[PDB]
Ligand binder design. Structure first.
Ligand SMILES: CCCCCCCCCCCCCCCC(=O)O
Length: 155
């Protein structure tokens, strides 16, 4: 149906972003010190998925109420993942900063955040009024999580 096809573009974008966050999380968990370039690369892959999502969703028409409701679960999932990943990254501040990666991690998070807020506002512009409050809450979660990271890797 057209209804499933409509939401599927949004779902695929969220899935692609979630996959990139998951890879980043896996490598953060595995990291205890030394070379962090593959980890930094993973961070930049999240930016690319977010940029691809912006490009794919830019001109999408407004979602119906039931279409937009189908995105609540997917977004809550991605958000929980982001929150946990950032927490895990902050838990590795010692070895990252110690290995000289502090500035690069901060810069990656700032760039992630700029793309994330752009996408969160774009998706929020596609949902009808009843979802405006939850869309703001979900947008704020992402922004707040990334900001928590940026602060941790500041001096
Ligand atoms: C019905 C739901 C509407 C919600 C709209 C706002 C939330 C969209 C989520 C955007 C995901 C961007 C995540 C990038 C994370 C990162 O770079 O670390």
């Amino acid at each position: 149906t057209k209804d499933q096809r409509d939401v599927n573009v949004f779902k695929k974008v969220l899935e692609n972003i979630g996959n990139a966050v998951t890879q980043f999380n896996n490598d953060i968990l595995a990291y205890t010190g030394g070379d962090a370039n593959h980890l930094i690369h993973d961070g930049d892959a999240i930016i690319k998925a977010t940029e691809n999502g912006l490009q794919e969703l830019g001109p999408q028409p407004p979602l119906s109420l039931t279409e937009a409701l189908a995105l609540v679960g997917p977004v809550q999932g991605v958000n929980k993942l982001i929150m946990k990943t950032v927490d895990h990254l902050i838990e590795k501040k010692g070895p990252l900063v110690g290995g000289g990666y502090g500035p690069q991690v901060k810069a990656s998070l700032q760039k992630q955040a700029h793309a994330a807020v752009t996408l969160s506002e774009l998706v929020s512009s596609k949902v009808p009024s009843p979802l405006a409050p939850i869309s703001k809450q979900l947008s704020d979660q992402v922004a707040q999580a990334l900001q928590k990271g940026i602060e941790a890797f500041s001096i």
